[PDB]
Ligand binder design. Structure first.
Ligand SMILES: Nc1ncnc2c1ncn2[C@@H]1O[C@H](COP(=O)(O)OP(=O)(O)OP(=O)(O)O)[C@@H](O)[C@H]1O
Ligand SMILES: Nc1ncnc2c1ncn2[C@@H]1O[C@H](COP(=O)(O)OP(=O)(O)OP(=O)(O)O)[C@@H](O)[C@H]1O
Ligand SMILES: Nc1ncnc2c1ncn2[C@@H]1O[C@H](COP(=O)(O)OP(=O)(O)OP(=O)(O)O)[C@@H](O)[C@H]1O
Ligand SMILES: Nc1ncnc2c1ncn2[C@@H]1O[C@H](COP(=O)(O)OP(=O)(O)OP(=O)(O)O)[C@@H](O)[C@H]1O
Ligand SMILES: Nc1ncnc2c1ncn2[C@@H]1O[C@H](COP(=O)(O)OP(=O)(O)OP(=O)(O)O)[C@@H](O)[C@H]1O
Ligand SMILES: [Mg+2]
Ligand SMILES: [Mg+2]
Ligand SMILES: [Mg+2]
Ligand SMILES: [Mg+2]
Ligand SMILES: [Mg+2]
Lengths: 260, 49, 147, 141, 354, 278, 351, 51
């Protein structure tokens, strides 16, 4: 009875935001478009252009700002059950594990040691080596030890049927990764989408190259990446794009060579 | 419980779990709604999609 | 094959007392008609686990990302009905055969193979899912797949 | 299929009919659910003539029918122009239980086909269909 | 103010008015019954106002019906799509043929198909030919196809539909084909009319045999356009100009001479054409000293018109960099050499219709 | 209530004023195609009893296919001009509409209108718009087009031998057509409109040039004998450009130089074949 | 009559109550009358326009109409896509031209083509030359292209529209073209304005001819971009900046001299540039006054600017590793090895 | 209406407001029959096969 249902719309433009009668153009999904006003229980500064809101069904007045829409497939990519592998289960990778931890774990655990000296820790690690050398094992160890949000992305999961969908998933992945104070994204088998750009006359791997370009833009572009520390593992690092293999996107390159 | 559910009971898609008793759900027509999850719902069966 | 798909289920105490997990995967390779699929049928006859059979050529889809999606859903269904045995018969046929319905060429097949790599041994924890693969051309398989 | 009261299913792989086969459409074996509902069934695919999709569908259906299909009386037929183009997997013994050749009709078979098809027409008496059959060397039905 | 009161009362009377649903008359059943289809909605058996003519309600007539009873309130003229209205009411820029250099032959070919048949139809009727209705301006980028179209739209006194092919594509089912149909309906209703579709390879590309659903929709748009250019209904007094720098990818049916009768090649400027374009673009440039346009022409081999405008711009930019109020020949030399250096990054341009 | 069958149709029949002015004589050199169309469309409409008596099953539909500009749509125009039956001209892209269900609704409206006005001819130009062989089930456009194609197949299947309606489909990309449309009872007569042969080229040249004030110095055999593989539209364009060049020089008689220049301009064939290959 | 006027206004206020239905004016007829299409996909005919003067309306105008009578109540601002409105910067990044090392010629070439025409327009009108239209910045990854874009956005008061190629790649047909033309329209309405399109090769891939399949939708988006840059309507009030690593992939119609007049090459930073970059990125870092940045520059052959910054970052890593509070030259030398990412080798048998 | 007569893929009539299943309509076309209608293979017997 008391709690009325609220239809989800998207605010489009605020007219006369300065004055005391600001009108809000909302786009109610597949329903319609309306010019409404905020309810008395919502502050005018709590609604911004382009954000999802929830409005009533009678006068469509904006009742509650809403979180941005995230694809459910992207949402499930975040790890909720940590793996059963610790760093004690990886042998012969002392230096590799130390280098990985001082990038992906130490800055999150003890940031105070870095801000004091004006130090900006690396925000990207590429684990590479022959198959079975322990790249995904070390990633699972990181996910087990980490306390921040850990997201596992397999490159083959970024391949989509339609044009621009993979880039959309990458954008939403980095959008939902930015809704956390600290976050880790694991890109297992990044060579699925991280291949080098080429022009073969036809449209050879154009869409996958666009997905990789979107990932690169999210890693180091005009907008700051945020507190996201990415992590990619591949057994074919020679196929990766030079722009993806560049510091600022993959700052550390940890080699999982065969054990001595 | 039957009276509270009513009839018919529409089939939608759980788009997002905003709160313990609040969620964004999309009906079959593609329109989303910010609705309330009632107590008798098996809240551990709720996942996006 | 019994030491990998039958004994671990009927007599797990052997493996527990020995301190080893059972052999993870099994691939049956040999000339055509030698009895690989017959042995898989015999395993399916005397198994208490859910048996899922998939031909390698069935993993080649008509749309981009649908191959990896099918592999992901196959192993999700395998995880749902645990314990289960996944029989990927004629796995080499995913690569040895080219069909024009496959929008992506060899690259989409490679992406499907990478998804299969993740499913066989990847980041996600695997339940009681046993994988049996059969092929008469094991030289054409990606060596990282059968590692 | 008509004389044995076996349901005749033609599998052309066309997408237009996919909605009838199933909303999934990820595997061709999704058609089996329909075939089991109409057993005895005869699954027919004709190769018009990358690799052949009809022969791939043959391989998948035969693999299912080998020992992994519970319901019986589900037969499967291919039609193909040539037998030397078939995949080695299909030509392996035990997959195709019988291979039947359909050579172009000879003079007598052409005469029989002519008699069958001219029966639907207002024919003057005394047509020398034998002569017309002799006038069509190397003809198909 | 009395006029203020009049306007306020006018607003008050307007407030009691109610909008009427726009539909289309399908068929008059009886003297008081009609079958009408809403623009985007179901078909209804409605009535009609007694005071209405009922003779202007031919099938296909757009009508306005009451919201409640759906009774035919009024008949309206054929609707003009807002996209089509924007196409017609698009400012070219007052471009004259004197702003185009080296294309006198191409200009004459274009005005032979678009200008003379609309002013002197009997000239072509006497010989016994139907004048061409479609021309395709093709060539390397920057040769002046869009400039030629702008000059034609600015100078020729005729109805003009100016559009870019990528701007008619819409995600709704059948919307792009409907836009094409409305474009040609407006052209037919406003004869004589000229339709200029820039960058025709956006929708005029070769029809894929194994494409996606989006490709199929774009091909349906393309071959609705094909049915409009040359289909069952003959197009009269409507001319089509299509511009593209990649005519090799166009559908063979679109390139067919029944639709695109003339194929005007806006080729890269030759020595005299480069000289003409340079004189056109270096005109308003403030200079002292002798300007040897011939040297810039000799070192401008392979340039296009945009290349030569860029040469003038970079000469002025060198003048600015040296803090000068004028441009000398040395600035032009540096500019043309810099543009030639920048030309090394451009791929193949020699593309011709098949 | 039940509405009259001819009512409730968004598609209208061709009126007298909408009849094209193209005659059979206007079309040059398609005697084979003309004969096939007449025997499959215009003859069964007037001689259905003869077809029944002989034992022939008249083809329900006709698929006219060939390279673009080879006289398909013009032959449809000539059929419409020279028919005593109703003609319902439509284009495949017209059926695809925003309102879901309106496509199949107007398909069945077209077929119902043709049935109610038998004898009738249904012409669907550019049939590829609703008769492609590939459908994506997750896109609304492909789902609607699949519905339209299924309704078309059902409408053609629901026409018994008694209903005197003939269907004509025209396309220049028949390789992309769905095979289900070519099954018996839907389109049993696939008529090809190939590129004109040398005799066809001379017939087209004579028919088109008969309407133009030529000079006796012009010999059409000079351009007919050329080995260029050109269509009827190419020949029409050659004659049209000859007239264009005649008009440019303020002339009402086309000379031989005009025809030579027009042929060179229209053909504009890059060699594309290196002599060392033969 | 004043009381009657006020009561009439009160009644209008009652009828003018929110919410409005957002519609687009389709047509204006005379028998003064309007035809509108509501956002509910319904077309209505209004015998009287309503509370908006019919002269102030044109086809396609966005209006707010009565939710019940569908009578036009007010006119609304132009509608731009929420993504396009979200791709406009307002934080105005805090970079500076002094934070870019070894690109003085490139910074000058970009500023005198993007900033100078906006501020010192009189230098062009007096010269009679058209200001340069569009600036492409191409070069190897890490040369400092996006950094220069951030610096340009920093030192400019003009409207800045940050953008990347993949953002214009959309599922539905015409959505990318709509986004491109909406972004250009928004930049026009807020002129003077700069549009920065990063990773131009995402949409700028060269068009090709194929028979079976192809990416015609992204090419349609690119064609819309080409028309916006230099098309039928000459847009000379919006400055366009693009960046790319692989200029060899771009369509030649995009590299034109009317769309991208100046194509600035960003080279590998040379020895002086490498030393300058390391000095720039060591500002907020406690570095001992004995590091030889010249020696570090000599030791970093074939290093891009990103690798030079990573050298300082890894030197800080190593200084933290051994607990030192001040970075020494040895830390920089050993972090050069880390940034080099040389594969592990037992090549101690050499020499 | 008996619940055992409500088989899957059956056509049913639901009330206007409650959507209550109040009638089992005649079953729709079988999906196999629908598929083979579009496939439309020619029916045949042994009598029309020669040689
Ligand atoms: N350094 C190591 N120490 C201990 N066990 C290891 C080590 N490296 C690999 N293993 C074992 O081998 C297995 C190989 O799987 P893992 O996920 O580590 O491979 P990977 O390097 O990711 O291979 P791929 O490149 O094929 O994805 C691990 O699950 C683990 O049991
Ligand atoms: N060693 C064997 N003992 C008994 N029967 C056998 C043996 N090998 C094969 N067969 C018989 O041959 C039949 C076909 O062989 P099967 O399909 O198992 O071979 P395969 O090696 O898996 O071949 P393919 O490579 O063609 O898939 C089996 O059903 C079985 O009856
Ligand atoms: N012949 C010419 N005379 C004068 N200016 C020219 C000429 N050709 C091109 N230009 C100049 O080139 C610039 C771009 O020309 P235009 O827009 O017509 O290109 P286009 O041929 O349409 O190329 P694209 O294929 O890239 O669309 C304009 O500034 C125009 O002034
Ligand atoms: N046999 C012919 N005689 C004379 N003119 C012909 C002939 N064939 C084609 N044409 C010319 O073709 C032109 C139009 O082509 P038409 O529409 O008939 O081709 P089409 O096969 O329908 O083409 P498309 O496949 O592109 O739709 C007419 O102007 C006509 O002069
Ligand atoms: N010349 C330079 N001077 C100072 N810093 C530089 C220079 N070149 C690169 N950098 C640094 O490199 C980092 C990323 O550089 P930037 O994003 O500008 O590279 P880019 O060439 O645009 O890369 P990509 O082509 O991969 O997008 C920044 O932290 C920036 O400070
Ligand atoms: Mg791994
Ligand atoms: Mg086998
Ligand atoms: Mg142009
Ligand atoms: Mg035609
Ligand atoms: Mg960059």
């Amino acid at each position: 009875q008391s709690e009325q249902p609220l239809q989800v719309a998207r605010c489009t433009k605020i007219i006369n935001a300065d004055s005391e009668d600001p009108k809000y153009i909302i786009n109610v999904k597949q329903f319609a478009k309306f010019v409404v006003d905020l309810s008395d229980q919502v502050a005018p500064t709590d609604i911004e252009e382009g954000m999802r809101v929830g409005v009533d069904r009678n006068k469509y007045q904006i009742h509650i700002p809403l979180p941005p829409k995230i694809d459910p497939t992207v949402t499930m990519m975040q790890v909720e059950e940590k793996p059963d592998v610790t760093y004690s289960d990886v042998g012969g990778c002392k230096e590799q594990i130390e280098k990985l931890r001082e990038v992906v774990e130490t800055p999150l655990l003890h940031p105070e040691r870095f801000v004091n000296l004006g130090i900006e820790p690396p925000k990207g690690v590429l684990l590479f080596g022959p198959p079975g050398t322990g790249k995904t094992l070390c990633a699972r160890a990181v996910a087990n030890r980490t306390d921040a949000c850990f997201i596992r992305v397999i490159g083959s999961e970024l391949v989509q049927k339609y044009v621009g969908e993979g880039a959309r998933m990458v954008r939403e992945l980095f959008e939902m990764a930015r809704t956390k104070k600290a976050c880790l994204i694991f890109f297992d088998e990044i060579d699925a989408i991280g291949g080098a750009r080429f022009d073969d006359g036809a449209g050879g791997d154009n869409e996958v190259q666009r997905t990789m370009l979107e990932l690169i833009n999210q890693l180091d572009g005009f907008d700051p990446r945020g507190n996201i520390k990415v992590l990619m593992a591949t057994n074919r690092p020679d196929t990766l794009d030079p722009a993806l293999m560049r510091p600022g996107r993959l700052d550390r390159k940890i080699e999982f060579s065969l054990p001595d | 419980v039957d009276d509270l559910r009513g009839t018919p009971m529409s089939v939608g898609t759980l788009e997002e779990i905003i709160d313990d008793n609040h969620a964004i759900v999309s009906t079959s027509v593609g329109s989303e709604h910010y609705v309330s999850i009632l107590s008798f719902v098996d809240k551990d069966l709720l996942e996006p999609g | 094959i019994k030491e990998s798909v039958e004994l671990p289920l009927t007599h797990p105490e052997y493996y527990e007392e020995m301190g080893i997990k059972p052999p993870k995967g099994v691939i049956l390779y040999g000339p055509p008609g030698t009895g690989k699929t017959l042995l898989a049928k015999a395993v399916a006859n005397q198994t208490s686990a859910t048996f899922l059979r998939v031909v390698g050529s069935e993993l080649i889809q008509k749309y981009l990302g649908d191959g990896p999606k099918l592999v992901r859903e196959l192993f999700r269904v395998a995880e749902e009905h645990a314990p289960s045995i996944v029989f990927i018969d004629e796995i080499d046929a995913i690569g040895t055969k080219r069909y024009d319905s496959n929008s992506g060429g060899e690259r989409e097949i490679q992406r499907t193979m990478l998804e299969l790599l993740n499913q066989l041994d990847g980041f996600d924890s695997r339940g009681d899912v046993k994988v049996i693969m059969a092929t008469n051309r094991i030289e054409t398989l990606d060596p990282a797949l059968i590692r | 299929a008509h004389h044995t009261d076996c349901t005749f299913i033609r599998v052309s792989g066309s997408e237009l009919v996919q909605k009838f086969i199933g909303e999934g459409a990820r595997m061709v074996r999704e058609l089996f659910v329909m075939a089991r509902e109409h057993a005895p069934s005869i699954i027919f695919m004709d190769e018009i003539d990358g690799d052949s999709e009809v022969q791939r569908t043959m391989l998948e259906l035969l693999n299912q029918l080998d020992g992994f299909e519970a319901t019986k009386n589900i037969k499967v037929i291919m039609a193909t122009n040539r037998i030397d183009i078939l995949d080695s997997a299909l030509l392996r013994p035990g997959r195709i239980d019988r291979k039947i050749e359909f050579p172009p009709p000879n003079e007598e078979a052409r005469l029989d086909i002519l008699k069958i098809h001219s029966r639907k027409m207002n024919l003057t008496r005394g047509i020398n269909l034998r002569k017309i059959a002799e006038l069509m060397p190397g003809a198909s039905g | 103010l009395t006029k203020q009161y009049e306007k306020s009362e006018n607003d008050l009377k307007a407030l009691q008015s109610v909008g009427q649903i726009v539909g289309e008359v399908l068929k008059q059943l009886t003297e008081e019954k009609f079958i009408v289809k809403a623009t985007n909605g179901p078909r209804y058996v409605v009535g009609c106002r007694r005071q209405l003519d009922k003779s202007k309600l031919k099938p296909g007539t757009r009508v306005a019906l009451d919201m409640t009873t759906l009774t035919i309130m009024r008949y309206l003229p054929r609707e003009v799509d807002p996209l089509v209205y924007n196409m017609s009411h698009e400012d070219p820029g007052n471009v004259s043929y004197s702003e185009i250099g080296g294309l006198s032959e191409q200009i004459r070919e274009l005005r032979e198909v678009i200008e003379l048949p609309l002013t002197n139809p009997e000239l072509f009727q006497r010989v016994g030919i139907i004048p061409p209705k479609g021309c395709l301006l093709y060539g390397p980028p920057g040769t002046g196809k869009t400039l030629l179209a702008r000059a034609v739209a600015s100078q020729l006194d005729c109805n003009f539909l100016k559009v870019v092919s990528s701007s008619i594509v819409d995600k709704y089912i059948g919307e792009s084909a409907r836009l094409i149909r409305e474009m040609f309906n407006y052209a037919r209703d406003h004869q004589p009319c000229i339709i200029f579709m820039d960058e025709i390879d956006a929708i005029g590309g070769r029809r894929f045999s194994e494409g996606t659903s989006a490709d199929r929709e774009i091909q349906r748009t393309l071959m609705e356009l094909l049915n409009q250019m040359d289909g069952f209904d003959t197009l009269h007094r409507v001319k089509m100009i299509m511009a593209t720098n990649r005519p090799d990818t166009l559908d063979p049916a679109l390139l067919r001479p029944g639709r695109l009768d003339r194929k005007i090649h806006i080729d890269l400027p030759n020595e005299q054409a480069r000289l003409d374009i340079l004189k056109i673009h270096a005109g308003p440039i403030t200079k002292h000293g002798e300007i040897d346009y011939e040297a810039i022409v000799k070192l401008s081999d392979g340039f296009n018109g945009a290349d030569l405008r860029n040469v003038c711009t970079e000469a002025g930019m060198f003048a600015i960099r040296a803090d000068h109020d004028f441009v000398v020949q040395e600035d032009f030399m540096k500019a043309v050499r810099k543009v030639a250096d920048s030309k090394k990054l451009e791929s193949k341009l020699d593309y011709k219709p098949v | 209530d039940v509405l009259p069958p001819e009512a409730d149709s968004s598609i209208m029949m061709l009126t007298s004023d909408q009849k094209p002015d193209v005659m059979y004589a206007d079309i040059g050199g398609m005697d084979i195609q003309k004969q096939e169309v007449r025997e499959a469309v215009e003859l069964p409409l007037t001689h259905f009893e003869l077809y029944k008596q002989i034992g022939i099953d008249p083809p329900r539909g006709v698929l006219m296919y060939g390279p673009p500009g080879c006289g398909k749509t013009m032959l449809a125009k000539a059929v419409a001009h020279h028919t005593t039956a109703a003609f319902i001209r439509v284009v495949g892209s017209e059926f695809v509409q925003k309102y879901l269900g309106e496509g199949p609704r107007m398909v069945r409206d077209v077929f119902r209108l043709a049935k109610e006005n038998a004898p009738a001819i249904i012409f669907i130009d550019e049939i590829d718009a609703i008769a492609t062989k590939r459908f994506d089930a997750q896109t609304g456009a492909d789902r609607e087009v699949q519905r339209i194609l299924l309704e078309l197949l059902n409408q053609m299947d629901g026409f018994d031998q008694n209903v005197n309606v003939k269907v004509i489909m025209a396309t220049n990309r028949a390789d992309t057509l769905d095979p289900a449309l070519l099954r018996p009872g839907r389109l049993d007569r696939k008529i090809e409109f190939p590129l004109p042969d040398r005799r066809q080229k001379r017939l087209i040249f004579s028919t088109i040039t008969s309407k133009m004030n030529l000079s006796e110095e012009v010999d059409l055999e000079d351009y007919v004998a050329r080995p260029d593989k050109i269509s009827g539209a190419d020949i029409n364009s050659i004659c049209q450009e000859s007239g264009m060049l005649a008009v440019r020089e303020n002339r009402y008689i086309v000379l031989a130089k005009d025809f030579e220049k027009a042929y060179k301009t229209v053909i504009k064939k890059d060699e594309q074949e290196h002599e060392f290959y033969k | 009559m004043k009381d009657k006027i006020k009561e009439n206004s009160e009644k209008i206020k009652v009828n003018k109550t929110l919410p409005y239905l957002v519609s687009n004016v389709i047509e204006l007829l005379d028998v003064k009358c309007a035809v509108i299409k509501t956002s509910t996909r319904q077309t209505y005919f209004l015998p009287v326009i309503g509370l908006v003067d019919a002269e102030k309306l044109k086809p396609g105008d966005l209006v707010g109409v009565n939710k019940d009578s569908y009578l036009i109540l007010e006119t609304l601002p132009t509608e731009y896509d929420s993504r396009v409105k979200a791709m406009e910067v307002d934080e105005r990044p805090t970079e500076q031209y002094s934070d870019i090392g070894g690109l003085d010629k490139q910074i000058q070439e970009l500023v005198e083509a993007i900033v100078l025409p906006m501020n010192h327009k009189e230098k062009f009108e007096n010269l009679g030359i058209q200001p340069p239209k569009g600036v492409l910045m191409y070069g190897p990854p890490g040369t400092g292209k996006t950094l220069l874009a951030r610096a340009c956005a920093a030192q400019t008061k003009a409207t800045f529209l940050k953008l990347a190629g993949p953002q214009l790649v959309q599922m539905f047909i015409g959505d990318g073209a709509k986004l491109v033309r909406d972004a250009f329209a928004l930049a026009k309405e807020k002129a003077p304005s700069i549009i920065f399109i990063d990773e131009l090769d995402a949409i700028g891939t060269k068009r090709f001819d194929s028979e079976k399949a192809g990416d015609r939708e992204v090419q349609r988006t690119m064609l819309e971009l080409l028309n916006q840059l230099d098309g039928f309507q000459p847009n000379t009030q919006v400055k366009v900046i693009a960046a790319t690593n692989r200029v060899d992939i771009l369509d030649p119609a995009l590299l034109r001299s009317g769309r991208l007049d100046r194509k600035i090459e960003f080279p590998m930073p040379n020895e002086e540039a490498r030393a300058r970059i390391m000095q720039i990125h060591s500002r907020k870092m406690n570095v001992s006054p004995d590091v030889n940045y010249e020696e570090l520059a000599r030791c970093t052959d074939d290093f891009n600017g990103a690798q030079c910054k990573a050298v300082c970052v890894e030197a800080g890593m190593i200084a933290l590793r051994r607990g030192a509070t001040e970075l020494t030259h040895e830390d920089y030398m050993e972090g050069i090895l880390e940034v080099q990412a040389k594969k592990k080798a037992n090549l101690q048998y050499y020499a | 209406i008996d619940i055992n007569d409500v088989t899957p893929n059956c056509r049913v009539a639901l009330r206007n407001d409650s959507y209550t299943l109040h009638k089992i309509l005649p079953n729709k076309v079988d999906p196999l029959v629908s598929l083979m209608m579009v496939e439309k293979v020619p029916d045949s017997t042994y009598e029309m096969i020669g040689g």
